[PDB]
Write an enzyme that holds these catalytic residues in place. Structure first.
Site, PDB file in Angstrom:
ATOM      1  N   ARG A   1      67.374  55.945 -92.411  1.00  0.00           N
ATOM      2  CA  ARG A   1      68.643  56.061 -91.707  1.00  0.00           C
ATOM      3  C   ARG A   1      68.387  56.611 -90.316  1.00  0.00           C
ATOM      4  NH1 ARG A   1      73.415  55.803 -93.911  1.00  0.00           N
ATOM      5  NH2 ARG A   1      75.306  56.560 -92.861  1.00  0.00           N
TER       6      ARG A   1
ATOM      7  N   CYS B   1      81.472  55.441 -85.470  1.00  0.00           N
ATOM      8  CA  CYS B   1      80.452  54.519 -84.992  1.00  0.00           C
ATOM      9  C   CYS B   1      80.719  53.036 -85.271  1.00  0.00           C
ATOM     10  CB  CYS B   1      79.089  54.893 -85.584  1.00  0.00           C
ATOM     11  SG  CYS B   1      78.947  54.635 -87.369  1.00  0.00           S
TER      12      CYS B   1
ATOM     13  N   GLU C   1      76.625  63.320 -82.908  1.00  0.00           N
ATOM     14  CA  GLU C   1      75.803  62.390 -83.668  1.00  0.00           C
ATOM     15  C   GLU C   1      76.495  61.025 -83.758  1.00  0.00           C
ATOM     16  OE1 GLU C   1      76.688  61.043 -86.768  1.00  0.00           O
ATOM     17  OE2 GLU C   1      74.930  61.037 -88.094  1.00  0.00           O
TER      18      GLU C   1
ATOM     19  N   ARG D   1      69.691  57.607 -86.663  1.00  0.00           N
ATOM     20  CA  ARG D   1      70.905  58.016 -85.972  1.00  0.00           C
ATOM     21  C   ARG D   1      70.504  58.652 -84.656  1.00  0.00           C
ATOM     22  NH1 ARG D   1      75.648  56.402 -88.266  1.00  0.00           N
ATOM     23  NH2 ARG D   1      76.661  58.351 -87.612  1.00  0.00           N
TER      24      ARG D   1
END
Ligand SMILES: Nc1ncnc2c1ncn2[C@@H]1O[C@H](CSCC[C@H](N)C(=O)O)[C@@H](O)[C@H]1O
Length: 327
Positions: A163, A81, A119, A165
């Site tokens: 977090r 990412c 993900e 995602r």
DNA sequence: GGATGCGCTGAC
DNA sequence: GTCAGGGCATCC
């Protein structure tokens, strides 16, 4: 991570691409699935993986003949990412580390698993005016898969960390899966102070900066959000201090600052960063998971990892959908 | 490799 | 305007 009583994925095979610590493996195995292949090119990631699963993942995926990969039912991939993060340059597909998705597509085209479970970071959803997400969607659809994507925040699933995602679940069209649903959020009952180790085990993590500027009063009442209490230096990434009565600031893999990778926390009157074991806990890893001997590499690995609990709920739902086959 | 001061976009 | 975002640049 949590305990899963009904093994929704028993009998299913999966592969662990961009393995890292093997978070996908822990999640899917807790639901009864069996891992038949893993790939990860980082030396230290391979070491921690082997330390925990007893096998060294294969190297560089861009050089692997997709035809050599074992048959499987679910493909797992928390691909790179750095090229899509707001913290970076956002070059996306124009970054050497931003084209790994196409390797996934190459493997899917050849192996055609029942499910593709990917993900990435939240910004992946809006990177390049949403064009990036659209490319993945179109690619998956053209490969004959449905495309379910949603940004989930760990704090909504029992993990005290902010977090966010994006999670992408794809079902092969012939399976006609029409009831997949992302887990529903629930009230957070655990906070940072609940995962901390005893002071005697983290004295070396204490940092005493004489340029510390407290910007807010400590809180006594726990809250499901990040609570900044002060800053160091210019308050950039890694120079921010938070309350342990709130939730954890997102862990980072390549982040800098005196409180690099974990951020700083006010604990018993002192400011310190987190211990690798506390990072493991804020990512949902069990205390039985063995962390890499190099703290620098362990911080990097956890800052790159997946939140186990979140993957567990999703995996359970994937299994639930695959198992609903009425007459 | 380890460490950290930084850069500056962007969510809202 | 505030401050989070889970990287970059560069030193040893
Ligand atoms: N070409 C490539 N071949 C194999 N692995 C690669 C790769 N490019 C990046 N990777 C690996 O991709 C990973 C992405 S981070 C994923 C971490 C994983 N979900 C776990 O739970 O922790 C990194 O560990 C990186 O080393």
């Amino acid at each position: 991570m949590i305990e899963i009583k009904d093994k929704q994925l028993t009998g299913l095979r999966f592969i662990d691409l961009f393995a890292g610590l093997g978070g996908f493996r822990l999640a899917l195995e807790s639901c009864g699935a069996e891992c038949v292949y893993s790939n990860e090119w980082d030396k230290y990631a391979q070491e921690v993986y082997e330390m925990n699963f007893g096998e060294k993942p294969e190297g560089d995926i861009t050089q692997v003949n997709e035809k050599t990969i074992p048959d499987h039912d679910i493909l797992c991939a928390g691909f790179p990412c750095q090229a899509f993060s707001i913290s970076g340059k956002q070059k996306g597909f124009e970054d050497s580390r931003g084209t790994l998705f196409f390797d996934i597509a190459r493997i899917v085209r050849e192996k055609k698993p029942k499910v593709v479970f990917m993900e990435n970071v939240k910004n992946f959803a809006s990177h390049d005016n949403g064009n990036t997400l659209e490319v993945v969607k179109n690619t998956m659809n053209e490969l004959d898969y449905s495309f379910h994507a949603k940004v989930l925040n760990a704090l909504d699933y029992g993990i005290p960390q902010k977090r966010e995602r994006i999670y992408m679940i794809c079902f092969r069209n012939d399976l006609n899966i029409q009831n997949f649903q992302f887990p529903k959020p629930f009230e957070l009952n655990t906070f940072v102070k609940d995962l901390l180790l005893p002071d005697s085990e983290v004295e070396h993590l204490v940092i005493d900066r004489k340029d510390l500027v407290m910007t807010n009063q400590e809180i006594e009442q726990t809250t499901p959000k990040t609570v900044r209490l002060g800053i160091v230096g210019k308050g950039g990434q890694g120079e921010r201090i938070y309350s342990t009565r709130g939730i954890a600031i997102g862990l980072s893999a390549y982040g800098g600052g005196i409180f690099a990778k974990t951020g700083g926390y006010l604990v018993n009157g002192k400011t310190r960063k987190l211990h690798p074991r506390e990072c493991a806990r804020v990512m949902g890893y069990p205390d039985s998971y063995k962390v890499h001997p190099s703290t620098s590499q362990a911080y990097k690995q956890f800052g790159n990892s997946v939140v186990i609990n979140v993957l567990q709920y999703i995996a359970y739902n994937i299994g639930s959908s695959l198992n609903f086959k009425p007459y």
